[PDB]
Each structure stands twice: as structure tokens, then as C-alpha cells.
């Protein structure tokens, strides 16, 4: 419910001693958590809002020149002097133009000249900063209640929406009939907003690297500049022309909006118009399932016929969902649901919507289950009018293992060492793997920062070749592994 | 506290070469004794103002 059909849906199964599980939430993904004797819940990070950001620097993308002035001095008499050179609104440059009797000078040679035009910014892009303590993550928690409309995720009306802030490490959501769920999220170890800028330019915003943003070759103003006219490196947006060493002119280069768009190729776009809400990045949380209980476990099984109102459908994740209308009496009853084999000798599938129940007779119910690979039968109801719905899955367990391995590898390529936090139960191997990943990721990020995916591919090919042509078996293997991982990261990057 | 009718938390001790031992009476925390050696901090016989 609210998590089927996202295609970036992960299944966290089981909780450790203590009834907590580590889940990493991402924007555009959804996590569904299942544990013995506990309801299946759907979790989704649906908003990261940065509040009250302070502007760090203004950049000029579209300027103009006015009040152009020029002055010359006869050769070997020094430099020309312009009053306009006194204030920094005027962009100036000094140059030499040959002079003689024709111009008005008494001797021949290269006389100094200076051109000064007023510099005005017509359009600027503002880069803002936000403290890691001013973020407000929003998470929608959706129980698999089997409600009719629960499949439609976008609304999230009956899912509880909790706002996670760094002010309090613990967030408690009370799901009616299910108890409460406690989330201990870590907004501080997320996107590291101390090292990023919120660059907004003409009704579009980007989340950029702070050092990259401060390296931009455009005229800029300080974050707190009231006048708006003391632009720092104006020379990046004007060109001075002395073609034949006769006269000098200054012209304005042209609007840099398109060049800025090209420069922003690798950034993630964000929203800046109505609040600084940005839909990107992840959030590690700890899920406390202690106070979480199944709903309607005190009801009795339904004694009546069920009719299918929406045919069985296969989700993108190897699960099936089906909506069933109820027709018997005892309105608040439990739906008898099981995925058997053909002879009904034993149960093959695993219900994902644990404890389906029909609360109201008229209201249909959506049940999701995970059938096994091959042939399975979905039996629904008691024998008189019992529904037996055949299903085929078209897959293999080896194929599922490959898919899961590739999905975990991608998660490692995206979250780095935070991948080891996903569905972690605090195992010793998990800790050691995460620490080793931190070490190797720090080394790799040092060695591979700032390059493009093509450079990553080239470096990986070179390293693989060097490892292959290495006398040492140990060094050969290590170099080949490094090259293969680098090639994978180059293939899976720029996204 | 801005109310200056009572002024606390501001103990300053002057240390001179003659009186290089002095105690601060930090209210509520007892007292602290500083046994300083001003005669070795700077050789003012080899310095001009």
C-alpha cells in the first residue's frame, strides 16, 4: 500500500534483538519493512526542506556597460588618468596605442590609453547556504492495511506524515490500530549541507558543491551586499578590444544563462520558488518496532464468498496484488488468504499484506503477496465459494540472486558506506564491512574526485591492464579488483 | 546576569613580582591559588618600551 509500482522499492525483512532495523530512505524510493508478528509498513522520504537559508554570494550572468570614457597620454609621459577609475563600478583597462603628429602628440611611440565603462548587472544567480540544523525531512509511513485506495501512493492521505528534524533524534508516529512506530533518524549525516550551496538562477535551483560554486569565473557580490554595484571580478564579463593598436573599446560579453546551464550538468535540480524544498538525497533511520502490533488480530475468519474486483497483477518487484470484495456476514472478519501448491499440500507463497481483513463489507480490500517462482495458487475464502487463482512467476532464484546482488551493488555505488546501514541489524560483519568501506571510499574519493565517467573508464582500463601484467599474484589481483570496481563505478555514474 | 545590583563570576587577580602568590575566591567553588613567577616571563632588563 503506497509502495507498489514505484520500481525503486526495497524489502527489509526482520528486526534484531531489540526490535529495531536500520533503513536508509531515499527520495524517489520506498522501503517496505516486514517482521514476524508485526504489520508490514511502507516508508518513503517525500521531502527535504531547507529553511531560512542565508545567501552566500551573488553572481553576475547578464551585465551591461555604459558611460564609456577613454583617455590617452603622449608616449613616454606615463599613464592616462580617468576620474571614473576612482570607483569600482567602472571596469577599466590600460593599453598602449601608437601616437604621433597626426593624433596630436609631439613625439612618436606607444602612448598609454585607459578605457572605463560603468558595469551594471542585469541578471544575477544567487547561491544560498543552509545550516544542517535547519533541514526538515518529511517521511510518510503507510501501513499495509489493505485499504481500497492504499495502492495509490501519491496521495498519502491515510499514511502518517512525520517531520524529522535534527532538533530531536526520536520521532514517534501513532498508526491507528497498529500502535506506534518510533524513528531515530540522522539528518546530520545525510547530504552534508555545510559543504553545499543552493544555487538558484532564474526560477530554477540547483544543489551544487560549495567549492565549485565559489570557483565560478563570474563577477560576484558578497552574500550581504546592500548596494549591489561593487562587483568583484567584472573582467570575466567584459572584453577589451585593441585590434590594430589604434583605439581601445570595451564591450559586454553576453548573457551567461546558457553557459551556466551547461556548467550545471552534473548537479541535481531542486525547487527554490515556494520554499527551499529539494527532492533529492537519502536519510538513514532506525526503526523501533517495539510498540508496533498487528491490527484486527482479534477478529474471526470470514465465513463467506469473496469476489475478485481487480484481477491479479504482478508488481515490478515479483509480488502480486489483488482486490477482493467480500459478500458474507460478520462484516469485521479476517480474509482467509494463502498461496498453496496445486494439491494444496503446503503453503508456497508469503503474504506481504499480513493479516488482511475486511473492515466493511462493501469496501473492497487490496492484498499483496509474494508467490514463489513457477506455479502457485492463491486460495481465498472458505470452501463454499472458495477462490483458487493460478499464477506463474517466470523467473529463477538464481536470477533473483543476481538481481539482488546488482541492486545492492548499485546501492553501494550511490550511498557508499551508508549502504551497509540498509536493513542492518548491527552485525559484527556489518560493522567491519562498513568500516572497511569507509576507508576504501575515502581513498577512492581522494583519488577520483573531479573526473568524469569517461576518465573513470580510462583509469579503470589502465589499472586492470597493469594488474593483469603484474608479476605478483597478490598485486595483480588487487589491481584487477580495483580496476573492475572503478570500471563499474564509471559505468554507473553521472546519474 | 544583567542585573548589576549583584555582580558575580568575574574574579580577576593581579600578580606582581613582589606578590606572586594570590588566591581567587570563586563564589560557590571554594578558592583557587595561583603561584606565579612573573620574574621569568619576560626579561625587562633587556627590553625598552
Amino acid at each position, epitope marked *: 500500500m503506497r509502495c507498489i509500482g514505484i520500481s525503486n522499492r526495497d524489502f527489509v525483512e526482520g528486526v534484531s534483538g531489540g526490535s529495531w532495523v536500520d533503513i536508509v530512505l531515499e527520495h524517489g524510493s520506498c522501503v517496505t519493512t516486514m517482521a514476524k508478528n508485526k504489520p508490514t509498513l511502507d516508508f518513503e522520504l517525500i521531502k527535504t526542506e531547507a529553511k531560512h537559508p542565508a545567501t552566500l554570494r551573488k553572481y553576475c550572468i547578464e551585465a551591461k556597460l555604459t558611460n564609456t570614457t577613454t583617455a590617452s597620454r603622449c608616449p613616454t609621459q606615463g599613464e592616462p588618468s580617468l576620474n571614473e577609475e576612482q570607483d569600482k563600478r567602472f571596469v577599466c583597462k590600460h593599453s598602449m596605442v601608437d601616437r604621433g603628429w597626426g593624433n596630436g602628440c609631439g613625439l612618436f611611440g606607444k602612448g598609454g590609453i585607459v578605457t572605463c565603462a560603468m558595469f551594471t548587472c542585469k541578471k544575477n544567480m544567487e547561491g544560498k547556504i543552509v545550516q544542517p540544523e535547519n533541514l526538515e525531512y518529511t517521511i510518510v509511513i503507510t501501513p499495509h492495511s489493505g485499504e481500497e485506495n492504499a495502492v495509490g501512493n501519491d496521495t498519502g492521505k491515510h499514511g502518517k506524515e512525520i517531520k524529522v528534524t535534527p532538533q530531536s533524534s526520536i520521532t514517534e508516529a501513532e498508526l491507528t490500530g497498529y500502535g506506534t512506530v518510533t524513528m531515530e533518524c540522522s539528518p546530520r549525516t545525510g547530504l552534508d549541507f555545510n559543504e553545499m550551496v543552493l544555487l538558484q538562477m532564474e526560477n530554477k535551483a540547483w544543489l551544487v558543491h560549495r567549492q565549485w560554486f565559489l570557483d565560478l569565473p563570474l563577477p560576484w557580490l558578497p552574500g*550581504a551586499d546592500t548596494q549591489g554595484s561593487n562587483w568583484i571580478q567584472k573582467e570575466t564579463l567584459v572584453t577589451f578590444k585593441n585590434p590594430h593598436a589604434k583605439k581601445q573599446d570595451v564591450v559586454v560579453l553576453g548573457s551567461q544563462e546558457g553557459a551556466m546551464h551547461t556548467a550545471l550538468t552534473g548537479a541535481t535540480e531542486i525547487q527554490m520558488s515556494s520554499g527551499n524544498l529539494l527532492f533529492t538525497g537519502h536519510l538513514k533511520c532506525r526503526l523501533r518496532m517495539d510498540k508496533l502490533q498487528l491490527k484486527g488480530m482479534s477478529y474471526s475468519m470470514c465465513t463467506g464468498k469473496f469476489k475478485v474486483v481487480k484481477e491479479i497483477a504482478e508488481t515490478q518487484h515479483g509480488t502480486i496484488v489483488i482486490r477482493v470484495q467480500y459478500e458474507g456476514d460478520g462484516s469485521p472478519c479476517k480474509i482467509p488468504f494463502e498461496i498453496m501448491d496445486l494439491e494444496k499440500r503446503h503453503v508456497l507463497g508469503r503474504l506481504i499484506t499480513v493479516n488482511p481483513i475486511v473492515t466493511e463489507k462493501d469496501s473492497p480490500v487490496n492484498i499483496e503477496a509474494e508467490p514463489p517462482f513457477g506455479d502457485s495458487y492463491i486460495i481465498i475464502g472458505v470452501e463454499p465459494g472458495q477462490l483458487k487463482l493460478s499464477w506463474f512467476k517466470k523467473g529463477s532464484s538464481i536470477g533473483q540472486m543476481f538481481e539482488t546482488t546488482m541492486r545492492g551493488a548499485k546501492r553501494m555505488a550511490i550511498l557508499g558506506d551508508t549502504a551497509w546501514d540498509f536493513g542492518s541489524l548491527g552485525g559484527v560483519f556489518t560493522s567491519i564491512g562498513k568500516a572497511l568501506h569507509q576507508v576504501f571510499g575515502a581513498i577512492y574519493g581522494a583519488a577520483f574526485s573531479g573526473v568524469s565517467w569517461t576518465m573513470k573508464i580510462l583509469i579503470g582500463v589502465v589499472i586492470t591492464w597493469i594488474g593483469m601484467n603484474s608479476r605478483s599474484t597478490s598485486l595483480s589481483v588487487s589491481l584487477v579488483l580495483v580496476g573492475v570496481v572503478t570500471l563499474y563505478l564509471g559505468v554507473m555514474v553521472q546519474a | 546576569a*544583567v542585573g*548589576n545590583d549583584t555582580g558575580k563570576h568575574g574574579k580577576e587577580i593581579k600578580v606582581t613580582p613582589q606578590s606572586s602568590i594570590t588566591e581567587a575566591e570563586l563564589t560557590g567553588y571554594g578558592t583557587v591559588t595561583m603561584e606565579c613567577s612573573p620574574r621569568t616571563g619576560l626579561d625587562f632588563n633587556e627590553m625598552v618600551l
Partner: antibody
Amino acid sequence: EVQLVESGAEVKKPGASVKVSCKASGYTFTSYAMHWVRQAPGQRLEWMGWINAGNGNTKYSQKFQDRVTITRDTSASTAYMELSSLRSEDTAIYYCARDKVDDYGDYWFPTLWYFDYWGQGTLVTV
Amino acid sequence: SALTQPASVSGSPGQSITISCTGTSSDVGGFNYVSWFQQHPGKAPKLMLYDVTSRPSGVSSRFSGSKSGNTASLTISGLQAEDEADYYCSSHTSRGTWVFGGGTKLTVL
């Protein structure tokens, strides 16, 4: 007790000049900077400038910068605010508020509790 | 550059009333030099809050201060008759000067 007392009310004519004093007692006069804040009848408080009694340094508002002169008298622990070329707009109460300077004697960063103690307020009319 | 405050404010006795002091990124949006002054008629201003929230030693605990972005807020919880006064907001700006709010007149009735 830390009481700040200013000279009495005065009546001046437009184009004249007025000097207002603020006598500081109960605290080390040299340890605090003296601020002058004027409030026109039934209007907002307006900051004019401050004098650092420790060294006589001053900072005026861009407004009042050319007309106001602030001086201190370390001997009397008194501060003065000279306003020259009074105009009809200069009728207002002129308050004095203190703010401690740092241990160096330099008063550039104030204390969070600036203006904790005020003078009673001197009225000037033109 | 004066800090902007509502011209007037009124609250029934025993209620809670809030005052706003909107400034720029330099005065009240950049630094914690936010102070609230209470001035009864015919009297000098009285420091009610400082450092945004901290209140003087004699100042009641009914007075609470908050700051968000370029705006600092003062809240009164008891709304006693003695609280009816004129409240001024001030900030030490980035250029080293002091700016004051326009002042809000709080009335219990």
C-alpha cells in the same frame, strides 16, 4: 547601584547647538562605552553613536555623523553629546545607555546585553 | 534600515501575544544581537530580552524571544496590565551600528 543621570531639559532655537551630559556612577566609568539614543515625541528610538570612555574613541550613525560630537570626562565619569545646528526635527529625549568594552579596552564587539542601563532621558526642544 | 514591527498590538489579559521584528541579513538575520526594550510612558527603555531569548535578571520569565531567518519575535504569556507598554526591537548590525524597531504599542483591552 549603577545609576545613569543626564542633564535637565533645555529649550533651544533652530540653528543653535545643545550639549547634553550623562553622569555615570556605581561602576567603573572607563570600563564601559556610552551610547546616545534619541527618541522624538511619540516616535521610535534612534541610535546616534557611542563613546569609549577608556580611550575616547567614537562611532556615530551615518545620520548625525556631521552634527553630533560625543565626549567623555574621565575625571567626572561624565559623557557629553554635542548636537550642533539644531533643527525642528531635533526635538526629542536624548537617552544614554552603556555597554561594557572588552578587557583590552577596545569597544568594537558589544556585549549581548547592550543598553542594559539607561539614563532617565534629557528633553531638548527647538 | 529600521527594524520593522507592527504599529500596534492588543491581547486579552491572561493570553499570549507575539511581536515581530523583521530586519535584513545584517541586523536581525545575521547576528544574535537582538534585544527587546520595554518603555512605559515617560520612562527610559527597559531591556526585556537580549541575545534573542536571554532575559535580564529582574525581567519576568513570562517574556520569551525567538528568531527565525530575518525575523525575531517577542512573546508575552501572562498579559498582565503592567505589561501594556511600548516595545522596541534593536540589533547590532554588521557595519557596527545599532538599528531600532518602529515600536509596537501593546494594549490589554
